[PDB]
Design a binder for this molecule. Structure first.
Ligand SMILES: [Cu+2]
Ligand SMILES: [Cu+2]
Length: 192
């Protein structure tokens, strides 16, 4: 029911520090090869007044090597910024559809997110475990900063269907104000 080549269509509606925006994207990935890529367009609220990197992990764990589901996530940044995100994932033929909501608050004006001083997420390892019959996933994430140094964030995801996973996520290309972004992720699961 999961095919070697699958398409992705997503819409994100969100806000950061009260400023609303929306983004649409199309892409394709290889579930069993643990690869995906996509092109993302800002439809509303552009040009975004915050670092695009806080969105990238929100833009599917089926894309990982060795009815649908949904997930909720909290991303707690070390300087007090909090982001909540959800994704409802459904399957339509050979096409995954993501309905995504994103909401961030309390990012300081002088911090690296609002001043767009972030470069990339360092590769990470998500720890997945079951609790109350649903799957949780925690990870310490870190954004690399332009002036050297790192910006810590704690991720807490709940997966709900209707070991480790190594992640690497890169923005391969973007225009000046990030209205267009090409985004790429690899992911493998392991254990012991
Ligand atoms: Cu760049
Ligand atoms: Cu690649």
């Amino acid at each position: 029911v999961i095919k070697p080549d699958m398409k992705i269509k997503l819409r994100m509606e969100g806000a950061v520090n009260g400023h609303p925006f929306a983004i649409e994207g199309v892409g394709l990935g290889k579930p069993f090869e643990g690869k995906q890529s996509m092109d993302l367009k800002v439809k509303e609220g552009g040009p975004l007044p915050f670092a695009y990197d806080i969105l990238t992990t929100v833009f599917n764990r089926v894309f990982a090597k060795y009815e649908g589901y949904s997930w909720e996530r909290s991303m707690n940044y070390e300087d007090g910024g909090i982001c909540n995100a959800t994704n409802d994932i459904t399957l339509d033929g050979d096409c995954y559809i993501y309905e995504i909501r994103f909401d961030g608050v309390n990012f300081p004006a002088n911090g690296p997110v609002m001043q767009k001083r972030t470069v990339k997420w360092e590769p990470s390892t998500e720890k997945l475990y079951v609790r109350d019959g649903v799957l949780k996933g925690d990870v310490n994430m870190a954004l690399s900063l332009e002036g050297g140094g790192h910006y810590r964030c704690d991720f807490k995801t709940t997966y709900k269907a209707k070991h480790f996973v190594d992640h690497h996520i890169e923005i391969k290309s973007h225009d000046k104000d990030y209205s267009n972004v090409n985004l790429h992720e690899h992911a493998e699961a392991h254990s012991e």
